[PDB]
C-alpha cells in the first residue's frame, strides 16, 4: 500500500555529568514509537582515571526512570511528525573535556541520523 | 508464540584496498536474511592525502555486484544457524596504516555484534 517517509534530525546535544541529552526532531511522515526497535550508538572519549579513552558502544532502550549506563530513554511514548523529544543517554564514564563525539540514531523503519560534534 | 534467540559473532576481519571483508557467524536460532533491515556502522581512520582522518559512517545494504562506497553486501541470501558468511563493506578511502577500527553489525531482530581491532 502506502509508503510513508521516515526522517529524523538532531536539534541539539547537551552534556550533564555522564548524561547526554539529545533533542530529536521528527521531520518525516511516520509516527515514531517503536523505540525498542531503534539502534543507538555513541562514540566518545571517556575520562578514565584522567586518561582520554576512546569508547564506542551500543545503547539499549528502556522506559526505566533511572536508566543504567549503556541505556537510553526518551521523554515521550510517541514522537509525531513535526514534534521533538529529548533522548537521554547514560554514558559509562564522564567525557574527557573538549573531545569529539558521534551519536548515531537509527529508527525502527531504517532511516537514521548521525550527529557529530564536541562534548 | 515462540521466541527464538538471535546471535551473531565476527570470526575475522580482512582488509584489501578499501574493502573490508567481515566473516559473520550465526550462533543463534533464527535465520538471518532480512539484510535491508540490518544496520552496519564502521569507524576507522581514513587515509585522506596522507592525513589519518577519523571516519564513522553508516553503510547501506545492496545486492549489487559492484557496491559503491558506503554500501555493504553479503555472499549469501540467507545465513542459517551454525553457518558463516562474508560481509563485504566498501569504505570511501583506504585505511591509514596501523590504525584502530570498529565495526557494528545490528541484525533486523535487534541483537548485534561489535568488532574492535586494527586495519
Q: Would you write up a description of this structure?
A:
Two copies of one chain form a homodimer. Chain A has one domain. The first copy, chain A, is mainly β and 119 residues long. In chain A, a hairpin with a 5-residue loop joins strand 7 and strand 8 (112-118). Chain A has strands at residues 8-16, 19-26, 39-48, 51-61, 71-74, 84-90, 100-106, 112-118. An eight-stranded mixed beta sheet of chain A has the order 1-2-6-5-4-3-7-8, with no helix packed on it. The first copy, chain A, is elongated, with a radius of gyration of 14 Å. The first copy, chain A, is built from no helices and eight strands.
In terms of topology, how is this protein built?
The structure is a homodimer of 119-residue chains.
Chain A: E1 8-16, E2 19-26, E3 39-48, E4 51-61, E5 71-74, E6 84-90, E7 100-106, E8 112-118
Parallel strand pairs in A: 4-5
Antiparallel strand pairs in A: 1-2, 2-6, 3-4, 3-7, 5-6, 7-8
PDB class: immune system
Keywords: immunoglobulin-like beta-sandwich, stator protein, immune system
Assembly: dimeric
- What strand order characterises the main sheet of chain A? 1-2-6-5-4-3-7-8
How many beta strands in the DSSP annotation of chain A?
8
Radius of gyration of chain A: 14 Å
For the biggest sheet of chain A, the summary is: 8 strands, mixed
Order of helices and strands of chain A: EEEEEEEE
Structural class of chain A: mainly beta
How many domains of chain A, as an integer?
1
Instruction: Give the overall silhouette of chain A.
Output: elongated
Q: Which chains share the greatest interface?
A: A-B, 17 and 17 residues
Amino acid at each position: 500500500l502506502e509508503q510513508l517517509e521516515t526522517k529524523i534530525t538532531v536539534s541539539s546535544v547537551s552534556l550533564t555529568g555522564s548524561t547526554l541529552n539529545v533533542v530529536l526532531e521528527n521531520n518525516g511522515s511516520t509516527n515514531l514509537y517503536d523505540f525498542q526497535g531503534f539502534s543507538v550508538i555513541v562514540q566518545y572519549y571517556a575520562n578514565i582515571s584522567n586518561i582520554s579513552t576512546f569508547n564506542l558502544s551500543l545503547y539499549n532502550y528502556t522506559k526505566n526512570s533511572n536508566p543504567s549506563p549503556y541505556y537510553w530513554t526518551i521523554n515521550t511514548p510517541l514522537l509525531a511528525p513535526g514534534s521533538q523529544a529529548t533522548l537521554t543517554i547514560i554514558l559509562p564514564y564522564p567525557p574527557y573535556p573538549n573531545t569529539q563525539a558521534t551519536v548515531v540514531i537509527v529508527t525502527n523503519y531504517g532511516p537514521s541520523v548521525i550527529w557529530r560534534g564536541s562534548l
